[PDB]
Amino acid sequence: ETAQTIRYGLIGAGHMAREHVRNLALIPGSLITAVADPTPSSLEETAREIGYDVQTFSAHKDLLASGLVDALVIASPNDTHLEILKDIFASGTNLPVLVEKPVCTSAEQADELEELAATYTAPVWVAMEYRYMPPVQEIIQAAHSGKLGNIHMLSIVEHRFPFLHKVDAWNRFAERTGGTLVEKCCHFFDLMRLILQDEPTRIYASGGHDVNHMDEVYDGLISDMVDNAYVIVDFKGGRRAMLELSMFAEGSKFQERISIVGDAAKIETLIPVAANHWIEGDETEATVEFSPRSPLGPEKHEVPVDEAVLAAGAHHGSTYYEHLGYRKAILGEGPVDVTVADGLQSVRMGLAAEQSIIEGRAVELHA
Amino acid sequence: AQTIRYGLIGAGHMAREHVRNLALIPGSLITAVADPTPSSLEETAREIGYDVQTFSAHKDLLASGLVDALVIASPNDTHLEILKDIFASGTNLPVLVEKPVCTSAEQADELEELAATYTAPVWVAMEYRYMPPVQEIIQAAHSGKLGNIHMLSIVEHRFPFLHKVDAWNRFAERTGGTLVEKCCHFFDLMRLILQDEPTRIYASGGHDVNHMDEVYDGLISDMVDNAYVIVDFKGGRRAMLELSMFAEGSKFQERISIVGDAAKIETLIPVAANHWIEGDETEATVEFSPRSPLGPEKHEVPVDEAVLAAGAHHGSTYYEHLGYRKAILGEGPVDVTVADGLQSVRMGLAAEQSIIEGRAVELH
Ligand SMILES: NC(=O)c1ccc[n+]([C@@H]2O[C@H](COP(=O)([O-])OP(=O)(O)OC[C@H]3O[C@@H](n4cnc5c(N)ncnc54)[C@H](O)[C@@H]3O)[C@@H](O)[C@H]2O)c1
Ligand SMILES: NC(=O)c1ccc[n+]([C@@H]2O[C@H](COP(=O)([O-])OP(=O)(O)OC[C@H]3O[C@@H](n4cnc5c(N)ncnc54)[C@H](O)[C@@H]3O)[C@@H](O)[C@H]2O)c1
């Protein structure tokens, strides 16, 4: 049981970086060595969380020259993801990267990243982790095993609280985030491609900035970000999906609903609000419900998460499994489950959707 | 109880639901029943349980002098002819005309002009609003208990289209399309709950599972069996409809969620006892979820055993009739007007048009 050891470098050391550290703390062989972030308060809090001594830098290139690291984790703001990847690619360090979603934030960016990512050879994983939520694992297995028959429809409903406060308010601005439908919803456009095993062809969306962040001023600016939307997505093989997002529906005991409908059965999972954002002492569990057409007879069970794994994140235990998988890719004992290609599609879908909200019209996509 | 003499024009599946419901309302007497299919007159006569005059054509029924009020429950594309005829009859009879009130744009234009000059009660039989659980949702929305409303979602997961006389419901040309035939109730609910008028609509649907390649009397089966619809409104609200006609395993057939800036509310309507398993009668729920303070409240909403048993629309048909009665007597208004019917149809038609051309459609 000699744990092989991986030395992790964190580039960006804020809210999500600290979720990575709590999760790596549950995985033997996991050691944080370097942490780069140009905001001192961020380095301080992240160092407190790690709980043991680490080298800190205020710039990533220094971290890259340190020789302190076996693998990278990028958790900086969305629009910075490309620069840091270009830099990692040109470093000659050939380091594995776990880069947070969205992998980028514009069409120009995605084009560039597509060409560049081809020549880089080390594991590059886009940190879209929703698929590893245990409840959502079942849903996906069921869909893939043909237990639903031919799949026709996928609905995703997220009802949640306004965008949280982040360092320098980066998440309040379309140009830094890619828009709400890239920032928040890329996870969901990915899930669509994964579950339906198909590529989108058309997308229409209707959304607004109707409720949130109205009294928050940032050097004379208000948030330009969407806080509610419906999205319909058409696919190559005649399947269709729908996304409902509200960022002011936080009263809802269940934050996510995902239903898949095939021609033999339907399946539906309900994901609760994380314990951190919900009332104290009212922890509900996630459910999965299987509903065959014939014979009638729905079966529903709770899908529990290990008390520790659940407590380490606000994404229902997913971050832990993401890291077990990143580890295996780093060691060569497993694949990159969520590629750059995956990331680029999810972003392009979200960008199309942001475009549809602006022009009041559907938008075509290319394979 | 004053007595109302009802004429049924069309005497199939839905006509028999009206009869079971009128049977629960004192003062209610069926006198005439018109339908061009003998077997239909026979079954409907068995259901009524007492003697009635039958005709094979509606104008005969209209001249009979047997009736105080009409109920049209014929196939969708016949609704206009019968209404034109009722209007020109000089009988000045109250009409309860089944949804959809018509099936094309030409039809709706015509009916709009004609219905203006007719003076007797004309009520469109979109009854979903009277389902007790749906009553709450609407009161909550109207009382401001949700705050300013931004989103309304409606999910129907159900069984394929049933078998009907002469297969009329298998053809877009006879029905107006699935989004008119099945979904007009829902586009109406949108206007009622949001208290607003739609401005744009986009939809994506297909004929992917059910009733592929059925020919019957010149037409080919062509009806949509799954669809998503987004509707934009004048006041910056938006609604979404999800329909699957092959999701009948779902213990809950309808889900309706409203999201405002102070709270969310959501009702779940179970499959009617007729279409569900024998052992497992479940009840409808309503769940209120305020943003601040957190604390969702959920209760079941029961229906009177009798009222529920008389229909497959969760007690709504009964209340529709209590209200039609009051309009007939002059002791009450027309809750669901022609205008209401025309909007719901135009919404559904726009949506059918959107599915065809891959593009959103404006509304007036
Ligand atoms: N996968 C998920 O479930 C999930 C959840 C939340 C956030 N995220 C992603 O994590 C990333 C950061 O989100 P967050 O909530 O931690 O935000 P945060 O603002 O709390 O943390 C961002 C940090 O990055 C630092 N930073 C800024 N510019 C930088 C640069 N040029 N180089 C390096 N670091 C820089 C900031 O100083 C800040 O400390 C984003 O990509 C976001 O989309 C993912
Ligand atoms: N409100 C609801 O919830 C609801 C539910 C079901 C049906 N409906 C409506 O009921 C109507 C009929 O559907 P159904 O299920 O009762 O159908 P059905 O096929 O069981 O009955 C229709 C009857 O109309 C008869 N008919 C045909 N042409 C006619 C004509 N020109 N004049 C008079 N009768 C004629 C047929 O012979 C048949 O007996 C449709 O408008 C449908 O939308 C409403």
DSSP state for residue B159 in the 8-state scheme? P
CA trace torsion B134, B138, B139, B144 (10° rounding): 150
CA B349 to chain centre: 15
The contacts of residue A22 (CB under 8 Å, 6+ apart) are A49, A312, A313
What is the side-by-side strand order in the sheet with A55-57? A55-57, A30-36, A6-11, A71-74, A97-100, A124-127
Residue B165's φ and ψ, nearest 5 degrees, are -65, 115
CA separation for the pair A14, B233 (Å, rounded): 40
Please name the residues in contact with B129: beta carbons below 8 A apart, sequence gap of 6 or more.
B135, B138, B188, B189, B192, B316, B335, B336
β strands within chain A, DSSP E: 6-11, 30-36, 55-57, 71-74, 97-100, 124-127, 151-159, 200-208, 228-235, 240-246, 254-262, 265-272, 286-292, 299-303, 363-364
Distance CA A182, CA A148 (A): 29
C-alpha separations of A198 from A82, A193, A350 in Å: 27, 5, 16
Instruction: Name residues contacting ligand 2 (CB within 6 A).
Output: B 9-15, 34-37, 40, 58, 73-76, 78, 98-99, 125, 127, 164-165, 168, 313
Closest CA to B129 of B320, B356, B324, B274: B320
Residue A291, token pair as written in the block: 């509903």
CA separation for the pair A33, A181 (Å, rounded): 34
For residue B352, give the 3-state DSSP assignment.
helix
CA B73 – CA A169 distance, rounded (Å): 60
Place of tokens 């219905």: B115
The answer to whether A153 contacts B289, with C-beta atoms less than 8 Å apart, is: no
Q: In whole angstroms, how far apart are CA B345 and each of A198, A233, B82?
A: 34, 25, 18
Q: How many residues does chain B have?
A: 364
CA-to-CA distance for A19 and A313, rounded, in angstroms? 6
| Nearest of A53, A23, A41, A365 to residue A204 by alpha carbon | A365
Report strand pairing: A200-208 vs A228-235. antiparallel
Cis omega (within 30 of 0) on the bond before A40? Answer: no
- Chain B residue with Cα closest to A242: B228
Q: How far apart are CA A79 and CA A106, in angstroms?
A: 8
Structure resolution in Å? 2.3
State the method: X-ray
Which of 1-20 (B) contact A at CB < 8 A?
A: none
> Which residues, numbered 212 to 271 in chain A, qualify as contacts with chain B under a Cβ-Cβ cut-off of 8 Å?
228, 230, 232, 234, 238, 240, 242, 244, 246, 248-253, 261, 263, 265-266
Provide the CB-side half-sphere exposure for A8 (13 A, CA).
Answer: 29
Strand, helix or coil for residue B18: helix
Tokens 């509610």 -> residue: A228
Q: Which of B83, B11, B126, B57 is nearest to B19 (CA)?
A: B11
- Strands in A299-303's sheet, in edge-to-edge order, are A299-303, A286-292, A265-272, A254-262, A151-159, A240-246, A228-235, A200-208, A363-364
B positions 285-314 inside 8 Å of A (CB): 289-292, 294-296
Domains, chain B, ordered by start: 4-125 (3.40.50.720), 128-303+335-362 (3.30.360.10)
Rounded distance between C-alpha atoms, residue A274 and residue A106, angstroms: 31
Backbone angles phi, psi at A65, to 5 degrees: -90, -5
B28 CB-near residues (< 8 Å, 6+ apart): B3, B4, B6, B22, B321, B325
Q: B92: how many CB neighbours lie within 10 A of its CB?
A: 10
- A345 CB-near residues (< 8 Å, 6+ apart): A189, A190, A193, A199, A200
Cross-chain Cβ contact A238/B359 below 8 Å: no
- Bridge partners of A98? A73, A125
Q: Which residues contact A288 (CB under 8 A, 6 or more apart)?
A: A135, A138, A139, A267, A268, A269, A300, A301, A303
Report yes or no: B157 at the A interface, CB cutoff 8 Å.
yes
Is A15 close to ligand 1, i.e. is its CB under 6 Å away? yes
- Binding site membership of A325 for ligand 1 (Cβ less than 6 Å): no
Residue B26's Cβ-count burial label (10 Å; 0-12, 13-18, 19+) is exposed
- Which residue's C-alpha comes closest to atom 38 of ligand 1? A14
| First-to-final CA distance of chain B | 44
**Which residue is listed with tokens 């934009």?**
B232
Please state, in angstroms and rounded to a whole number, the distance separating the CA atoms of residues A179 and A177. 5
B155 vs A: CB within 8 A: yes
Say if residues B67 and B6 touch (Cβ distance below 8 Å). yes
